[PDB]
């Protein structure tokens, strides 16, 4: 769920607030359209697409499904007791959190005008 995804980010990017990723580029946060503006935005596009796929699973709601995972000693893991929906969503989140950690953050791309620039 979104609370858990926030914690994943806090565990892989303890250097910045999670809010920095909540409204960035064309894909991070609300936006789900147009040309990804940079590497970090591409991380979010993959994540958005990954949720759309998970939603194909009967009764699977990515924002709300509680999965089982661990974040310790520099390692993020989705545990074995996840059902198909939990496992998929956990993986989407995990991969995005790792992606965020290796992507440059451009303050210029925070809070951009979605209507004008993400067409």
């Amino acid at each position: 769920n979104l609370y858990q995804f926030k914690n994943m980010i806090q565990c892989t990017v303890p250097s910045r607030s999670w809010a920095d990723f909540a409204d960035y580029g064309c894909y991070c946060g609300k936006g789900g359209s147009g040309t990804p503006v940079d590497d970090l935005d591409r991380c979010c596009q993959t994540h958005d697409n990954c949720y759309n796929e998970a939603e194909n699973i009967s009764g699977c709601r990515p924002y709300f499904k509680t999965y089982s995972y661990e974040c310790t000693q520099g390692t993020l893991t989705c545990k074995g007791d996840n059902n198909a929906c939990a496992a998929s969503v956990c993986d989407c989140d995990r991969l995005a959190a790792i992606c965020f950690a290796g992507a440059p953050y451009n303050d210029a791309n925070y809070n951009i005008d979605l209507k004008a620039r993400c067409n």
């Binding site: 995804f5 980010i9 999670w18 809010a19």
Partner: peptide, 5 residues
């Protein structure tokens, strides 16, 4: 459309 990070 809700959030991230």
């Amino acid at each position: 459309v809700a959030f991230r990070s």
